[model samples]
Target chain A: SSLLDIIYQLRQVPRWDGSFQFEKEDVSQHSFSVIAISHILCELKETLEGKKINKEKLLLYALYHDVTEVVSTHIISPVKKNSILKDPFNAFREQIKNSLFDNLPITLSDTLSTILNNNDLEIQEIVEHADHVDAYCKSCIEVHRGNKDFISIQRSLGDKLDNLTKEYPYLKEFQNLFLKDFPLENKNYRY
Target chain B: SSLLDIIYQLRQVPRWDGSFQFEKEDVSQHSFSVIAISHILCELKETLEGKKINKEKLLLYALYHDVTEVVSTHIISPVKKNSILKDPFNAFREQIKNSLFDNLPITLSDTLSTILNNNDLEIQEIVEHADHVDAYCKSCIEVHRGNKDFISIQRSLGDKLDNLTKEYPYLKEFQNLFLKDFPLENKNYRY
Candidate 1:
């Protein structure tokens, strides 16, 4: 019950809370974006680097990456970036993350722990890169909608993405080939 | 561009538009719930029936099951239940689903096509069951929050779930074991 309750709360926790978003986004939506982007990044890596990734693991991790936010609530990027609070906040998050899984069956909890606290550095890196990319994508949409508040956010995220691409050329390729097209001027679909 | 554009809009599409929801849910968050529930259902099937499912495909299908809504917009259950529009609406949805994948590379699109248009009856059943379970879970949360409007929805979803459980005993096991715990009165989480 506790475990499922936490899952139920995920949709209630909004993301980019203090921003004037054109369309409000919650952790659930953001998590799905991360999962989608992570899958594409893994596929791109396999094609470009001739390397295999544990995609099932990567996808699961992506789905639950922000789940801890349900308990912690969303701490905006600026607040999370505080160097003094960063380490302590992360430790608190880890504790809460583990506690949330405690009510599940032992085997299930163990599997989830493996997924959430994944030790595979490569998988971790992919998820982190996808995480930032999703944020950048959000910023692009906001800017396209004439939300100037997102301009600075878009620039900072772009800078971070560029830095990530410098370390991983495949990301640069993804950005060059796909990122530009994310912000559509007009689409018939209505939200 | 078109493919990613469709994805970027997933978060923008809301669910249960006319209802008084305690916490609004979007297709992305609801999709994530379906994915999570589907995974659990598959695991339970494996444990209880010793049946192995194509979990990767199942999760992907669960993720994209509502993607067509981005183009079609969400059709509420009452409107969707209208006998006059059901068949044509389904056909239109299928067309949009296919078109969404058209801009992708051939191999990637083919893979997504297979995942989205899966012919496996069993996987189809699991996704449907999971989809309804997520709705039931949502109604449970609303009712727990004292939203009487969801009482009817909760009852209707319960009836559907009971019918589903009768066909799949594993699902019954899951409900008896886990569903009741989904609605908690209080917790430290601040969503």
Candidate 2:
């Protein structure tokens, strides 16, 4: 229901001097980092489809994935480590929820808005997974390009993702090929 | 006044995240980019008769020009070349506005809302120049780092900017220096 609310909060994601890749090819007018994260979530939803639990939750989670950055501005890596000291991620999420209702647009119907804004367990997990997938993709891109910035973290990202498979064992194995030199450079949603 | 609304929108410019340069730096806030763009408007206002003609209008235009990206997300280059043609920039612009009203903390009472939606000559011209200046500045940053990806854009943007200025006449001087690289990023405003 808070989809509109959540969108209102996240609509504030800042573009630092960094981040040109996301700008080049966007699917839904969102940032490339976000849209890409959403894409990973879409793949994840399909991968996790047959589970006995709620499937819709996962989709909403993916869509709401980057909502936290509306305020924190998305600190990747050790930047987030520093974030822990000043602001815990949990508190930030809490703040975002409060901010959401206060910010939802008039155009969105109330029911659709509420569905998105209400945070649940399934939504959190999906959003976390979506974020990790994005981070993993970023690491892969960095490694293939021979950029050292993410080199140190790439393996860690892979290991972290591998561990998640234990919880959801049926999930497809993420091939590094997704992160390989040939690269996806995937365009829009269309063919 | 939706000062908060406009400010929030300005705070949300999406980072592009391409190549090493984008990842290396933090993506800027919409406010920062607008702040940077408005500086150019200030320069124009000081230089041109438009200041007397409609200075506040130009400043407001420059200020809110990219505010809509808060919703639509910020898409950068190459890949953007094709998609932008189909939907055009205005659609992208309006989507951000829709996002803004939907997401911003408070509804635009009246004053702030009008500032964002206005379409006077002063607003349009300033916004175009602001866009060019922003792109040119991004290109310069890339060039400063010796990134070849930005080199071509640096040149092409200059030529294109020149055409823009020609249409407006007085804005001619800015097109040259918009991409002129200085050591620090914000030197454009300070100097």
Candidate 3:
């Protein structure tokens, strides 16, 4: 039920025009963000269990991380907003969120509200971490799919990842494991 | 070896100019036909034990099934003498049949030629049936991904499927068993 709700909410994550996949098979930014954040949480969960790190909020944090964007309509990315829905963007974002939640089952309303709240500081960071990790992983994906031409993208992603490492010390080990190399190849995914 | 050679040769199938898929997944016409035809041959081989169907043959056939279109490039369909490039189209078809054999392995040349000579008679009806089935399946994929407007396309594909099924006495049963009874509610696909 929760997974279905996540899928429903994600189907409408706004795109910066051409950034969206034209085909159904391609992954969406929302979906990628979910997966990227999920990966970080999984690692954080293990670290907590091992007492290697004293963190417990990573899971919920990552899950609700993008909740704000649902209402913000993914506008004001650190880089730039999609130019397609320019002028009345705020209204569109509200309409989009309203439309997305219009049929949302009453059972999930409270949980979604909590996730989308700014005061939910612990969960809010998960979104930030996911954004950080996604940019890194996306860099890797482009490189892997491009045969050998994605070196520059991989490098830029590395820089973003390095900055993220400086931003979050709890994620230091994960950086050592995944972001150490510029690209992943036939990875079983471990340090 | 014969199957592999056939697939390699079939890679010359020409794609239609404006044809596309929203998913951007490479579901080219020849790709669809190759997979469909290969499935047919695989089923055929079930009765003829040890007759393996290689991916090479299937993909090759998928690749070039429409290459004859190089001559019929200007004409859309309903082949007739008055149609634009209709004579040239026929000539192209003849050229393809005669010249395509040059790529086949020596041992299977005679058998492949025999099959190619009567290609339409042997496989045309089956290929057409598979084509509709592929379209239906692609439509289902789109709808599964939340596309609501596949109704018109499904209708067209369904009609073609009905006509194609009538061409094959046994295929009618197979279609009824596999395609017609698709259970959208369940994930189980009965063999």
Candidate 4:
């Protein structure tokens, strides 16, 4: 199974506070959202504003972004957000990412690690934005289910998503397309 | 955004009768699961049994596997199981697949359509098995959450999965790796 085993394990690994919740998503599903969302945002820039972006690179970043979690279970946002764990988590995440590349086919493994560890500032921001968009989508779902606890998370995520989409006017509308289905105001109605 | 829009629509297209139930999942997430699961199985065949399989073909089929659902909404299994709609559904699916490639870059679009329509029987079976595996996994989740309706589906799916894995012993064990956390015995698990 080689590399696929890594992703396969993620299907078992829980996300967000270490257990499935009303928001209910696994690392595997979350990775798909990030990848799919990133793919759409990049395509939006090109189609609406004539700003070309690399579709392949976008997909690659989404695909490998969370595989490192197989080696290290997903760290919940609150724990990961704590300033004390920030530096240590980064180093641990990188070590796990590098170790996973071992005992595998060189070309495929190298490509995965290279993209996961890519340091280009602009590209890094784009990928991180996609990750936040996924978090935003998950929060929206929780809110849709009448989980009032997510209201604050939804507001914070919206602010972050808004900031990222500012770079591309059409991108904001693109995000709206998804939000309409899971309206934040629907806290009173279960989606 | 041509192809990416297609993927974006999938995130909104819920599978298994269109709402988050015990069996909830979306088309975008389903496609990634199919791709990732298919990748592992093919690799297992090659490394464990020395049976060479087309890696590129496997991933391509899984990635584009359900994109056409964007054009035509997902029809749940129970509804599609009706034999009366079988032939008509097949024809309609092909028509929509062809229609999607229109207005896109010719060479690339044509290549995508070609791969999507590949008739290699062996590879076709593998891809379809991966799809069923995805369904089985979803069913397991439902059953794990105490929905007995999926118990029968899980059993039927297990038979099919068992038949396929007979060729590669390690595959059975690999499948177990994904199922360990999802014991159908847990009807009380609200996950």
Best by the DockQ measure: 1
Tens-place lDDT per residue, model 3, A54-124, is: 12233333434444353454553434445655656646544544434332333234434443443655445
Residue-level lDDT of model 2, residues A75-191, one tens digit each, is 544555675554676576656645544322232224224445655675566566656665665556555556665565778887888788666532233332233322333312111
What TM-score results for chain B when candidate 4 is compared with the true chain B?
0.81
Ranking by DockQ: 1, 4, 2, 3
Q: Estimate the TM-score of every prediction.
A: 0.92, 0.41, 0.38, 0.62
Q: After superposition, how far is residue A187 of candidate 1 from its true place, in Å?
A: 2.4
Task: Give the alpha-carbon lDDT of every model.
Answer: 0.81, 0.47, 0.44, 0.66
lDDT of 1 by residue, A146-175 (tens): 999999999999998989898897798678
lDDT of 4 by residue, A67-140 (tens): 77776678887898799998899898877765665444444556566777877564565667778877877777
The candidate maximizing TM-score is 1
Q: In candidate 3 chain A, where is summed lDDT lowest over 10 consecutive residues? A: A20-29
Q: Per-residue alpha-carbon lDDT of model 2 for B93-135, expressed as tens digits?
A: 6555543443121212243466677857656756666666666
Docking outcome class, model 4: incorrect
Q: List the candidate 2 regions with Cα displacement exceeding 4 Å.
A: A1-191, B1-13, B22-33, B42-46, B50-53, B77-85, B92-99, B102-108, B175-191
Top candidate when judged by lDDT against the true structure: 1
Model 4: runs farther than 4 Å from truth? A18-21, A48-51, A119-123, A168-170, A176-191, B1-29, B37-64, B67-84, B91-191
Candidate 1 Cα outliers beyond 4 Å, as residue runs: A188-191, B188-191
- Report residue A129 deviation for candidate 4 (angstroms): 1.2
Weakest 10 consecutive residues, lDDT, candidate 3 chain B?
B1-10
The CAPRI class of candidate 2 is incorrect
Give the alpha carbon lDDT tens digit for every residue of B1-191 in model 4.
24533544466678888434654578877888787667656655565666776655565667778877776679876667679987788888888776665444443455577767887776677678778877877777677677777788789887887887786564575575555455434322111
Span of 10 residues, lowest total lDDT, candidate 4 chain B: B182-191
Clashes of each: 0, 41, 14, 0
